[PDB]
């Protein structure tokens, strides 16, 4: 089974490009990272920064996680990210996504490595 750390990388890391290229970025990346296999994963976020910069966030601002746990960290700086959201018509196995490029602060939950 892949570990939680590996699934985090698969589902969210895209250090190969600095930002979403085109409106077809979500469509391609959701399929590519295998997120449209059994089902259409409804929402996903890709971070366009080095893995090192993303792992470093675990030593940045401590904040509460949405579930109330206390192991969440907020990046000090804004990061290049791409939000992928399933359109209303999209139907498995024809998964359609809207792509939104933005520069934001990410909040990650951290665990031992």
């Amino acid at each position: 089974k892949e570990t939680a750390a590996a699934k985090f990388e698969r589902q969210h890391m895209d250090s190969s490009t600095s930002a979403a290229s085109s409106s077809n970025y979500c469509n391609q990346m959701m399929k590519s990272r295998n997120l449209t296999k059994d089902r259409c994963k409804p929402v996903n976020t890709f971070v366009h920064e080095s893995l090192a910069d993303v792992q470093a966030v675990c030593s940045q601002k401590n904040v509460a996680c949405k579930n109330g746990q206390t192991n969440c960290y907020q990046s000090y700086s804004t990061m290049s990210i791409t939000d992928c959201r399933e359109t209303g018509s999209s139907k498995y196995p024809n998964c359609a996504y809207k792509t939104t490029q933005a520069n934001k602060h990410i909040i990650v939950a951290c665990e031992g490595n």
Binding site: C72, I107, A109
Partner: peptide, 11 residues
Amino acid sequence: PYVPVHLDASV
């Protein structure tokens, strides 16, 4: 040591 396991949110 400490590594990201979940993306809780953006901004």
